[PDB]
Design a protein around this motif. Structure first.
Motif, PDB file in Angstrom:
ATOM      1  N   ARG A   8       0.829  -1.196   0.000  1.00  0.00           N
ATOM      2  CA  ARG A   8       0.000   0.000   0.000  1.00  0.00           C
ATOM      3  C   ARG A   8       0.863   1.245   0.000  1.00  0.00           C
ATOM      4  O   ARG A   8       0.650   2.147  -0.810  1.00  0.00           O
ATOM      5  CB  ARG A   8      -0.916   0.025   1.217  1.00  0.00           C
ATOM      6  CG  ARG A   8      -1.752  -1.205   1.359  1.00  0.00           C
ATOM      7  CD  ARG A   8      -2.588  -1.107   2.603  1.00  0.00           C
ATOM      8  NE  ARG A   8      -1.754  -0.925   3.781  1.00  0.00           N
ATOM      9  CZ  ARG A   8      -2.226  -0.546   4.962  1.00  0.00           C
ATOM     10  NH1 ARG A   8      -3.537  -0.406   5.127  1.00  0.00           N
ATOM     11  NH2 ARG A   8      -1.412  -0.490   6.007  1.00  0.00           N
ATOM     12  N   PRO A  15      -8.107   1.479  -2.701  1.00  0.00           N
ATOM     13  CA  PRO A  15      -8.868   1.521  -1.459  1.00  0.00           C
ATOM     14  C   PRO A  15      -9.795   0.322  -1.298  1.00  0.00           C
ATOM     15  O   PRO A  15     -10.115  -0.367  -2.269  1.00  0.00           O
ATOM     16  CB  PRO A  15      -9.687   2.809  -1.595  1.00  0.00           C
ATOM     17  CG  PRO A  15      -8.836   3.687  -2.460  1.00  0.00           C
ATOM     18  CD  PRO A  15      -8.232   2.736  -3.463  1.00  0.00           C
ATOM     19  N   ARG A  44       0.742   3.036 -13.131  1.00  0.00           N
ATOM     20  CA  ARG A  44      -0.589   3.604 -12.957  1.00  0.00           C
ATOM     21  C   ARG A  44      -1.501   2.620 -12.234  1.00  0.00           C
ATOM     22  O   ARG A  44      -1.626   1.462 -12.636  1.00  0.00           O
ATOM     23  CB  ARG A  44      -1.195   4.004 -14.304  1.00  0.00           C
ATOM     24  CG  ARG A  44      -0.614   5.293 -14.887  1.00  0.00           C
ATOM     25  CD  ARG A  44      -0.988   5.471 -16.360  1.00  0.00           C
ATOM     26  NE  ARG A  44      -2.437   5.495 -16.571  1.00  0.00           N
ATOM     27  CZ  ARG A  44      -3.119   6.557 -16.999  1.00  0.00           C
ATOM     28  NH1 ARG A  44      -2.491   7.699 -17.251  1.00  0.00           N
ATOM     29  NH2 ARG A  44      -4.432   6.476 -17.181  1.00  0.00           N
ATOM     30  N   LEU A 180      -0.421  -8.725   6.483  1.00  0.00           N
ATOM     31  CA  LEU A 180      -1.328  -7.607   6.292  1.00  0.00           C
ATOM     32  C   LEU A 180      -2.285  -7.953   5.164  1.00  0.00           C
ATOM     33  O   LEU A 180      -1.853  -8.251   4.041  1.00  0.00           O
ATOM     34  CB  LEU A 180      -0.546  -6.348   5.932  1.00  0.00           C
ATOM     35  CG  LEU A 180      -1.011  -5.006   6.517  1.00  0.00           C
ATOM     36  CD1 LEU A 180      -0.857  -3.881   5.495  1.00  0.00           C
ATOM     37  CD2 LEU A 180      -2.435  -5.066   7.048  1.00  0.00           C
ATOM     38  N   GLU A 187     -15.019  -0.637   4.440  1.00  0.00           N
ATOM     39  CA  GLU A 187     -14.018  -0.055   5.321  1.00  0.00           C
ATOM     40  C   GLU A 187     -14.502   0.016   6.773  1.00  0.00           C
ATOM     41  O   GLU A 187     -13.755   0.420   7.659  1.00  0.00           O
ATOM     42  CB  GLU A 187     -13.594   1.327   4.816  1.00  0.00           C
ATOM     43  CG  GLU A 187     -14.767   2.193   4.376  1.00  0.00           C
ATOM     44  CD  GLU A 187     -14.463   3.675   4.436  1.00  0.00           C
ATOM     45  OE1 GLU A 187     -13.275   4.044   4.293  1.00  0.00           O
ATOM     46  OE2 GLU A 187     -15.406   4.466   4.679  1.00  0.00           O
ATOM     47  N   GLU A 188     -15.731  -0.424   7.026  1.00  0.00           N
ATOM     48  CA  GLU A 188     -16.243  -0.467   8.399  1.00  0.00           C
ATOM     49  C   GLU A 188     -15.889  -1.774   9.111  1.00  0.00           C
ATOM     50  O   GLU A 188     -16.057  -1.896  10.321  1.00  0.00           O
ATOM     51  CB  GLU A 188     -17.767  -0.235   8.454  1.00  0.00           C
ATOM     52  CG  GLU A 188     -18.365   0.487   7.245  1.00  0.00           C
ATOM     53  CD  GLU A 188     -18.635   1.961   7.506  1.00  0.00           C
ATOM     54  OE1 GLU A 188     -19.729   2.291   8.022  1.00  0.00           O
ATOM     55  OE2 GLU A 188     -17.794   2.796   7.109  1.00  0.00           O
ATOM     56  N   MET A 191      -9.919  -3.276  10.551  1.00  0.00           N
ATOM     57  CA  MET A 191      -9.119  -2.078  10.744  1.00  0.00           C
ATOM     58  C   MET A 191      -9.125  -1.236   9.465  1.00  0.00           C
ATOM     59  O   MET A 191      -8.261  -1.409   8.590  1.00  0.00           O
ATOM     60  CB  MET A 191      -7.696  -2.480  11.135  1.00  0.00           C
ATOM     61  CG  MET A 191      -6.756  -1.328  11.386  1.00  0.00           C
ATOM     62  SD  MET A 191      -5.145  -1.909  11.948  1.00  0.00           S
ATOM     63  CE  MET A 191      -5.274  -3.668  11.635  1.00  0.00           C
ATOM     64  N   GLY A 192     -10.245  -0.552   9.247  1.00  0.00           N
ATOM     65  CA  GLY A 192     -10.563   0.043   7.948  1.00  0.00           C
ATOM     66  C   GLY A 192     -10.564  -0.950   6.796  1.00  0.00           C
ATOM     67  O   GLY A 192     -10.106  -0.641   5.692  1.00  0.00           O
ATOM     68  N   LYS A 196      -4.723  -7.989  10.467  1.00  0.00           N
ATOM     69  CA  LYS A 196      -3.421  -8.614  10.681  1.00  0.00           C
ATOM     70  C   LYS A 196      -3.618 -10.064  11.084  1.00  0.00           C
ATOM     71  O   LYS A 196      -4.271 -10.350  12.088  1.00  0.00           O
ATOM     72  CB  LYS A 196      -2.633  -7.885  11.774  1.00  0.00           C
ATOM     73  CG  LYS A 196      -2.361  -6.422  11.491  1.00  0.00           C
ATOM     74  CD  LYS A 196      -1.921  -5.689  12.760  1.00  0.00           C
ATOM     75  CE  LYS A 196      -0.887  -4.615  12.457  1.00  0.00           C
ATOM     76  NZ  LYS A 196      -0.560  -3.772  13.658  1.00  0.00           N
TER      77      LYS A 196
END
Ligand SMILES: *[C@@H]1O[C@H](CO)[C@@H](O)[C@H](O)[C@H]1NC(C)=O
Ligand code: NA
Lengths: 216, 219
Positions: A8, A15, A44, A180, A187-188, A191-192, A196
């Motif tokens: 990331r 996202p 890109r 990870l 995203e709710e 951890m967004g 882990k």
């Protein structure tokens, strides 16, 4: 060999998205890995169309919102000779007829590589290649409710390792090693939208279930 | 439009962590400049906050003891460049300047200050990209924030001094025109809030805004 890796940070990873109530995680996992490899090639980052995969990759063996396989997705892209952007071909969270339009294709691939079911192998791939598609056991209530910290699979079993996700890196919390892992539950969750996962465990198992990545 | 979300459009890098250094101003500025560079080039490149912390003293910034996003934007103009995050990594402490122009990946041309009206901020967010602003981050419930809509518990201009990045707005409900919020990217790492983000109460009826010190760089 590096002790931490996080793709990331390097710009390889879009996202977090949300699959909805549709059993299409295999598609988000596949697009994640292809997004990574397209970034490496072009520089890109372009969000890719899961819906393209869900609608169109039946002939390779995928079953839309009823499930499927990252490898079948990578094979579709090769056979098809492209895949549309997320923007051109938005997610509906339901299977419809194919709408692939070659004029909006922003990705190819050239094959795919399966990684052996070994955490050492997965480490080397993640360190080297980019985000890797894997399938995990996502069935347990503690994983539903996950918020933070290292998550420990209560329970090792091949059959249950059947939710597709994206390994985007690994590190340590300290000893206390973790993958990870980017999920597709919006995203709710977690951890967004990340988790882990405990790594190099001791008790021998194991998230390198069906690990693979496309070649570009 | 009634929802805007610049993350989905590619404008926004992943959440960063300022550590124990009072440098939110720098992360807010780099976020806003990352947006506008993307809008221009279509390449999203993570920008050096350390470069800002170390080097933008002469524009009025004070490194780990505070500064302003406008000063950051001015520095980038005056300097004629800003290094990438990769080339000039974040250390969470102020050291001597080490800008190297060979490694510049961003310019700007100045900046535009937005009036403190929530409507002028809404237009900018709708139209420009992610916007730098400063909010009041001092309250315990902001510290412990995890999810949902956050309501600033008082209105107080002098306490709105934590720079963040407004990357969109929308609404919770099934309704809309109810439970409105700004989407705000913090720099407290991904374990704060909702993956490092917070939904802030928007268009409130006590007329307390969050468009404190709003601006974006021009490129
Ligand atoms: C920024 O502008 C300066 C001066 O016009 C120019 O020399 C430089 O090449 C530009 N750098 C980038 C990264 O756009
Ligand atoms: Na199909």
């Amino acid at each position: 060999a590096p002790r931490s890796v996080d793709w990331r940070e390097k710009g390889y990873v879009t996202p977090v998205k949300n699959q909805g109530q549709c059993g299409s995680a295999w598609a988000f996992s596949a697009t994640g890995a292809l997004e990574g490899q397209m970034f490496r090639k072009t520089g890109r980052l372009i969000s890719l169309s899961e819906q393209n995969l869900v609608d169109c990759s039946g002939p390779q063996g995928n079953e839309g919102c009823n499930g499927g396989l990252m490898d079948y997705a990578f094979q579709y892209v090769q056979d098809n000779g492209g895949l549309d952007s997320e923007e051109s071909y938005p997610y509906e969270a339901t299977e419809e007829s194919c709408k692939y339009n070659p004029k909006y294709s922003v990705a190819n691939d050239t094959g795919f590589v399966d990684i052996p079911k070994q955490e050492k192998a997965l480490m080397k791939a993640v360190a080297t290649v980019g985000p890797i598609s894997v399938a995990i056991d996502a069935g347990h209530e503690s994983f539903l409710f996950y918020k933070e910290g290292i998550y420990f699979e209560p329970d090792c079993s091949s059959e249950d390792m059947d939710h597709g996700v994206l390994v985007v890196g690994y590190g340590f919390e300290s000893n206390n090693k973790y993958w990870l892992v980017k999920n597709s539950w919006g995203e709710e969750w977690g951890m967004g939208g990340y988790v882990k996962m405990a790594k190099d465990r001791r008790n021998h198992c194991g998230i390198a279930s069906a690990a693979s990545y496309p070649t570009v």
